[PDB]
Write a protein that binds this ligand. Structure first.
Ligand SMILES: O=C(O)c1cc(O)c2c(c1)C(=O)c1cccc(O)c1C2=O
Ligand SMILES: [Mn+2]
Length: 201
């Protein structure tokens, strides 16, 4: 395997993509995309929003999952059907039939935007996989191992690609390299990524 515990499903979301993007726009109409500030004080180049019961966000100089969007003071929008159903099909195919995400982080990349190498290890149950769905322009995804200094590997993620990151891979350090400019007929000039998480207890 390229990554222990990971299941790559290329073009799995290709047919669903137009609906998924419509639903991204619907979510963003309620909880807008925003570029969050890191604890180090830097404005992220990736713009974000969330849907589901919980949303990943900065709050009081840390990160956490919150039921309320701090920008609107309202709940994050409910998980769209298209999101829920796509995630469940992917997770089930990959051997995680009980995966029940309560958070979906929606990342938007303009040309040049990047995501610095990091782990997601603050979720209560690290046995639950993350399901990652790529839409629009292609991006180079980098991933290493459980330690920051483990060797990095790189994989192009293209429109409609889904990866279910389970087992050990769930805790790999990962990031996205600066997005190359281009054109995609459904997203125009950007990439979106959905990451479904079980963030609740
Ligand atoms: O493409 C993106 O914007 C994007 C951003 C993320 O933060 C993650 C991913 C993609 C993953 O695919 C992923 C893989 C394995 C474990 C994880 O925690 C993550 C994520 O957190
Ligand atoms: Mn992450």
């Amino acid at each position: 395997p390229l990554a222990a515990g990971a299941v790559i499903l290329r073009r799995f979301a290709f047919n669903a993509a137009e609906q998924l993007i419509r639903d991204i726009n619907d979510v963003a109409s309620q909880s807008p995309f925003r570029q969050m500030v890191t604890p180090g004080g830097y404005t992220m180049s990736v713009a974000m929003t969330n849907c589901g019961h919980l949303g990943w966000t900065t709050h009081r100089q840390g990160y956490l999952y919150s039921p309320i969007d701090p920008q609107t003071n309202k709940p994050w929008p409910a998980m769209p059907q298209s999101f829920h159903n796509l995630c469940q099909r992917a997770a089930t195919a990959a051997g995680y039939p009980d995966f029940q995400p309560d958070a979906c982080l929606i990342n938007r990349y303009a040309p040049g935007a990047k995501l610095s190498l990091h782990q997601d290890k603050d979720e209560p149950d690290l046995r639950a996989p993350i399901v990652s769905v790529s839409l629009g322009l292609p991006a180079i995804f980098q991933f290493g191992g459980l330690k920051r200094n483990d060797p990095l590997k790189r994989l192009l993620l293209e429109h409609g690609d889904v990866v279910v990151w389970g087992g050990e891979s769930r805790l790999f350090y990962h990031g996205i390299q600066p997005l190359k400019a281009g054109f995609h007929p459904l997203t125009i000039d950007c990439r979106y990524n959905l990451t479904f998480r079980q963030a609740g207890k």
